[PDB]
């Protein structure tokens, strides 16, 4: 669709809406999501359910010596949005991972619904401050 965005920014407009009215929604948004409405980061165990074996290349990057990987890699993920597929930089080493696990599941939940996200918000705190 291409006016997607404004759908989106429609979508949390209406979400205000009903929190505002005090009416319920039928609406079951992920924690991931909840947390972006919110502002707070996701932790890597919301992987699990968005991308199993995602989160299980994670789960082996953690309580593992980056030596068994037997390649290297960096802070940078080949990431689909919109349907078109581009390597993006994140920003490795048994320092950045504690960040690159953080950070790699900020990229890969938001990078294809950035611009989503930002119209979805743009229609909620349009009616409910953020703080």
Not at 16 to 27: G, H, I, P, Q
Not at 42 to 70: A, C, I, K, P, W
Not at 107 to 114: C, E, P, Q, S, Y
């Given at each position: ?29 992920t ?13 890597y ?18 309580e593992?010596?980056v ?20 390597v ?9 991972k504690?960040?690159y ?31």
């Amino acid at each position: 669709n291409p006016n997607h965005l404004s759908y989106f920014k429609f979508v949390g407009r209406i979400v205000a809406k009903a929190v505002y009215d005090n009416r319920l929604l039928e609406c079951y948004f992920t924690r991931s999501f909840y947390k972006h409405i919110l502002g707070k980061s996701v932790r890597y165990t919301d992987m699990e359910s968005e991308d199993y074996h995602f989160y299980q290349g994670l789960v082996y990057l953690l309580e593992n010596d980056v030596s068994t990987l037997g390649y290297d890699l960096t802070f940078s993920t080949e990431v689909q949005e919109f349907g078109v597929c581009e390597v993006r930089d994140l920003k490795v080493t048994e320092e950045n991972k504690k960040e690159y696990v953080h950070l790699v599941c900020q990229m890969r939940m938001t990078g294809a619904i950035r611009k989503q996200l930002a119209a979805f918000l743009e229609g909620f705190y349009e009616i409910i401050p953020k703080r």
